[PDB]
Swiss-Prot record:
Component of the adaptor protein complex 2 (AP-2). Adaptor protein complexes function in protein transport via transport vesicles in different membrane traffic pathways. Adaptor protein complexes are vesicle coat components and appear to be involved in cargo selection and vesicle formation. AP-2 is involved in clathrin-dependent endocytosis in which cargo proteins are incorporated into vesicles surrounded by clathrin (clathrin-coated vesicles, CCVs) which are destined for fusion with the early endosome. This is AP-2 complex subunit alpha-2. GO terms for molecular function: clathrin adaptor activity; disordered domain specific binding; kinase binding; lipid binding; protein domain specific binding; protein kinase binding. It comes from Mus musculus. Changing Q81A: Reduces DENND1A- and DENND1C-binding. The gene is Ap2a2.
Protein backbone atom coordinates (compact mmCIF):
# COMPACT_ATOMS: atom_id res chain seq x y z
CA UNK A 1 0.00 0.00 0.00
CA UNK A 2 1.09 3.67 0.16
CA UNK A 3 1.73 6.60 2.49
CA UNK A 4 -1.32 8.74 1.53
CA UNK A 5 -2.32 9.79 5.06
CA UNK A 6 1.11 11.28 5.74
CA UNK A 7 0.56 13.78 2.91
CA UNK A 8 -2.53 15.60 4.20
CA UNK A 9 -0.34 18.07 6.13
CA UNK A 10 2.93 17.83 4.16
CA UNK A 11 3.72 17.91 0.41
CA UNK A 12 7.09 16.21 -0.03
CA UNK A 13 8.36 12.66 0.57
CA UNK A 14 8.11 8.99 -0.29
CA UNK A 15 4.62 7.92 -1.37
CA UNK A 16 5.33 4.21 -2.06
CA UNK A 17 8.22 1.71 -2.16
CA UNK A 18 8.26 -2.02 -3.13
CA UNK A 19 11.32 -4.16 -3.88
CA UNK A 20 11.76 -2.73 -7.39
CA UNK A 21 10.54 0.88 -7.39
CA UNK A 22 10.33 3.89 -5.11
CA UNK A 23 7.77 6.68 -5.89
CA UNK A 24 8.61 10.08 -4.45
CA UNK A 25 6.63 13.30 -4.56
CA UNK A 26 7.19 17.04 -4.43
CA UNK A 27 4.12 19.35 -4.70
CA UNK A 28 3.28 23.06 -4.57
CA UNK A 29 -0.19 24.68 -4.59
CA UNK A 30 -1.41 28.23 -5.23
CA UNK A 31 -4.95 29.54 -5.64
CA UNK A 32 -7.08 26.62 -7.06
CA UNK A 33 -4.01 25.13 -8.79
CA UNK A 34 -1.09 22.82 -8.05
CA UNK A 35 1.95 21.19 -9.57
CA UNK A 36 3.07 17.76 -8.43
CA UNK A 37 6.40 16.26 -9.38
CA UNK A 38 6.40 12.44 -9.29
CA UNK A 39 9.77 10.67 -9.12
CA UNK A 40 10.07 7.07 -10.26
CA UNK A 41 13.24 5.36 -8.93
CA UNK A 42 14.51 2.01 -10.25
CA UNK A 43 16.15 0.22 -7.29
CA UNK A 44 17.40 -2.71 -9.41
CA UNK A 45 20.31 -3.19 -11.75
CA UNK A 46 18.20 -3.71 -14.89
CA UNK A 47 16.17 -1.28 -16.97
CA UNK A 48 12.35 -1.14 -16.91
CA UNK A 49 10.54 -1.11 -20.33
CA UNK A 50 7.04 0.07 -21.42
CA UNK A 51 7.03 2.22 -18.26
CA UNK A 52 3.47 3.58 -18.19
CA UNK A 53 2.00 5.64 -15.34
CA UNK A 54 -1.75 6.45 -15.70
CA UNK A 55 -3.82 8.79 -13.50
CA UNK A 56 -7.29 7.37 -12.91
CA UNK A 57 -10.21 9.40 -11.62
CA UNK A 58 -13.79 8.35 -10.87
CA UNK A 59 -15.92 10.21 -13.40
CA UNK A 60 -17.55 12.26 -10.67
CA UNK A 61 -14.03 13.18 -9.54
CA UNK A 62 -13.08 14.28 -13.09
CA UNK A 63 -15.83 16.96 -13.13
CA UNK A 64 -14.28 18.52 -9.98
CA UNK A 65 -10.53 18.09 -10.58
CA UNK A 66 -8.68 18.47 -13.86
CA UNK A 67 -5.30 16.73 -14.10
CA UNK A 68 -2.90 17.22 -17.03
CA UNK A 69 0.45 15.50 -17.59
CA UNK A 70 2.84 14.98 -20.55
CA UNK A 71 4.14 11.47 -21.45
CA UNK A 72 6.86 10.10 -19.18
CA UNK A 73 10.06 8.48 -20.43
CA UNK A 74 9.18 4.77 -20.93
CA UNK A 75 12.62 3.29 -20.13
CA UNK A 76 14.04 3.66 -16.59
CA UNK A 77 17.63 2.49 -16.28
CA UNK A 78 18.55 0.52 -13.18
CA UNK A 79 19.56 2.93 -10.37
CA UNK A 80 18.10 5.96 -12.13
CA UNK A 81 15.01 8.09 -11.61
CA UNK A 82 12.50 9.59 -14.08
CA UNK A 83 10.21 12.56 -13.41
CA UNK A 84 6.55 13.14 -14.20
CA UNK A 85 4.92 16.57 -13.75
CA UNK A 86 1.18 16.70 -13.01
CA UNK A 87 -0.52 20.09 -13.40
CA UNK A 88 -3.66 20.27 -11.26
CA UNK A 89 -6.78 22.47 -11.54
CA UNK A 90 -9.43 22.31 -8.76
CA UNK A 91 -12.83 22.87 -10.42
CA UNK A 92 -15.16 22.35 -7.43
CA UNK A 93 -14.78 20.81 -3.93
CA UNK A 94 -14.19 17.00 -3.89
CA UNK A 95 -13.68 14.02 -1.54
CA UNK A 96 -12.32 11.24 -3.73
CA UNK A 97 -8.60 10.99 -4.59
CA UNK A 98 -7.07 10.08 -7.95
CA UNK A 99 -5.34 6.70 -8.38
CA UNK A 100 -1.89 6.45 -9.98
CA UNK A 101 -1.51 3.14 -11.82
CA UNK A 102 2.02 2.15 -12.83
CA UNK A 103 2.63 -0.64 -15.38
CA UNK A 104 6.02 -1.78 -16.68
CA UNK A 105 8.08 -4.74 -17.85
CA UNK A 106 10.96 -5.89 -15.67
CA UNK A 107 13.13 -8.96 -16.30
CA UNK A 108 10.63 -10.24 -18.90
CA UNK A 109 7.65 -9.92 -16.53
CA UNK A 110 4.58 -7.72 -16.18
CA UNK A 111 4.61 -5.52 -13.03
CA UNK A 112 1.51 -3.56 -11.90
CA UNK A 113 1.16 -1.10 -9.04
CA UNK A 114 -1.72 1.14 -7.97
CA UNK A 115 -1.50 3.82 -5.26
CA UNK A 116 -3.66 6.74 -4.12
CA UNK A 117 -2.31 10.19 -5.01
CA UNK A 118 -2.40 12.78 -2.18
CA UNK A 119 -4.45 15.58 -3.79
CA UNK A 120 -6.96 16.57 -1.05
CA UNK A 121 -9.25 19.63 -0.69
CA UNK A 122 -7.13 21.37 1.98
CA UNK A 123 -4.29 21.70 -0.52
CA UNK A 124 -6.29 24.62 -2.06
CA UNK A 125 -6.34 26.77 1.07
CA UNK A 126 -5.41 30.45 1.27
CA UNK A 127 -4.59 31.19 4.97
CA UNK A 128 -6.50 34.22 6.32
CA UNK A 129 -5.18 36.06 9.39
CA UNK A 130 -7.84 37.94 11.37
CA UNK A 131 -8.52 39.70 14.64
CA UNK A 132 -10.68 38.20 17.38
CA UNK A 133 -13.66 40.48 16.73
CA UNK A 134 -13.52 39.63 13.02
CA UNK A 135 -13.29 35.87 13.62
CA UNK A 136 -16.34 35.80 15.96
CA UNK A 137 -18.51 37.99 13.76
CA UNK A 138 -17.98 35.53 10.90
CA UNK A 139 -18.35 32.41 13.09
CA UNK A 140 -21.71 33.71 14.36
CA UNK A 141 -23.06 34.27 10.82
CA UNK A 142 -23.67 30.58 10.14
CA UNK A 143 -27.34 29.79 9.52
CA UNK A 144 -27.58 26.35 7.95
CA UNK A 145 -26.85 23.62 10.46
CA UNK A 146 -25.26 21.28 7.85
CA UNK A 147 -22.58 23.93 7.31
CA UNK A 148 -21.29 23.10 10.84
CA UNK A 149 -19.61 19.69 11.28
CA UNK A 150 -18.39 18.48 14.69
CA UNK A 151 -16.23 15.47 15.63
CA UNK A 152 -15.23 14.39 19.16
CA UNK A 153 -12.49 11.77 19.00
CA UNK A 154 -9.68 10.12 20.95
CA UNK A 155 -6.17 11.59 20.63
CA UNK A 156 -3.82 9.44 18.59
CA UNK A 157 -0.83 11.55 19.61
CA UNK A 158 0.33 13.25 22.82
CA UNK A 159 -1.04 16.81 23.22
CA UNK A 160 2.34 18.41 22.44
CA UNK A 161 1.28 22.01 21.68
CA UNK A 162 4.02 23.00 19.23
CA UNK A 163 3.49 19.85 17.15
CA UNK A 164 -0.28 20.50 17.14
CA UNK A 165 0.32 24.10 15.96
CA UNK A 166 2.64 22.95 13.17
CA UNK A 167 0.04 20.36 11.99
CA UNK A 168 -2.67 23.08 11.79
CA UNK A 169 -0.32 25.26 9.70
CA UNK A 170 0.55 22.37 7.39
CA UNK A 171 -3.15 21.63 6.98
CA UNK A 172 -3.38 25.01 5.25
CA UNK A 173 -5.46 27.51 7.22
CA UNK A 174 -4.03 30.39 9.24
CA UNK A 175 -3.46 29.58 12.97
CA UNK A 176 -4.98 32.56 14.84
CA UNK A 177 -3.42 33.36 18.29
CA UNK A 178 -5.36 34.57 21.37
CA UNK A 179 -8.70 34.62 19.56
CA UNK A 180 -10.42 32.00 21.66
CA UNK A 181 -10.61 33.22 25.27
CA UNK A 182 -9.74 29.65 26.40
CA UNK A 183 -5.95 29.49 26.01
CA UNK A 184 -5.97 25.69 25.65
CA UNK A 185 -7.96 25.97 22.37
CA UNK A 186 -6.79 26.31 18.75
CA UNK A 187 -8.52 28.51 16.14
CA UNK A 188 -8.00 28.66 12.35
CA UNK A 189 -9.34 30.51 9.29
CA UNK A 190 -8.80 30.29 5.55
CA UNK A 191 -10.40 30.13 2.16
CA UNK A 192 -10.72 27.05 -0.05
CA UNK A 193 -10.17 28.05 -3.67
CA UNK A 194 -11.83 26.41 -6.68
CA UNK A 195 -12.50 27.43 -10.29
CA UNK A 196 -16.19 27.82 -9.65
CA UNK A 197 -16.51 28.96 -6.04
CA UNK A 198 -14.43 30.32 -3.15
CA UNK A 199 -15.40 28.78 0.24
CA UNK A 200 -14.78 30.63 3.54
CA UNK A 201 -13.72 28.24 6.36
CA UNK A 202 -13.36 28.57 10.15
CA UNK A 203 -12.11 25.89 12.55
CA UNK A 204 -11.94 25.35 16.32
CA UNK A 205 -9.93 22.54 18.02
CA UNK A 206 -10.55 21.91 21.73
CA UNK A 207 -8.41 19.49 23.73
CA UNK A 208 -9.72 17.64 26.79
CA UNK A 209 -6.51 16.91 28.81
CA UNK A 210 -8.07 14.43 31.30
CA UNK A 211 -9.86 12.37 28.62
CA UNK A 212 -7.13 12.68 25.96
CA UNK A 213 -9.85 13.59 23.48
CA UNK A 214 -10.54 16.47 21.14
CA UNK A 215 -13.62 18.21 19.83
CA UNK A 216 -13.08 19.64 16.32
CA UNK A 217 -15.62 22.06 14.77
CA UNK A 218 -15.70 23.27 11.13
CA UNK A 219 -17.92 26.16 10.03
CA UNK A 220 -17.76 26.88 6.28
CA UNK A 221 -19.89 28.38 3.50
CA UNK A 222 -20.54 24.89 2.03
CA UNK A 223 -21.75 21.69 3.75
CA UNK A 224 -19.61 19.25 1.80
CA UNK A 225 -16.49 21.37 2.42
CA UNK A 226 -17.17 21.39 6.16
CA UNK A 227 -17.57 17.60 6.02
CA UNK A 228 -14.47 16.83 3.98
CA UNK A 229 -12.22 19.18 5.95
CA UNK A 230 -13.42 17.89 9.30
CA UNK A 231 -12.74 14.25 8.31
CA UNK A 232 -9.28 15.05 6.96
CA UNK A 233 -8.14 17.16 9.93
CA UNK A 234 -9.59 14.83 12.54
CA UNK A 235 -7.09 12.13 11.50
CA UNK A 236 -4.02 14.24 12.39
CA UNK A 237 -4.23 14.46 16.21
Amino acid sequence: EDNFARFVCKNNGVLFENQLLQIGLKSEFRQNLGRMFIFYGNKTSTQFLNFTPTLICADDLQTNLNLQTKPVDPTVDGGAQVQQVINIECISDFTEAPVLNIQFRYGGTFQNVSVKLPITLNKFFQPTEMASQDFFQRWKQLSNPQQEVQNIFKAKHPMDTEITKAKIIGFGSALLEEVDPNPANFVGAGIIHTKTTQIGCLLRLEPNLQAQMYRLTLRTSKDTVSQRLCELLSEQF
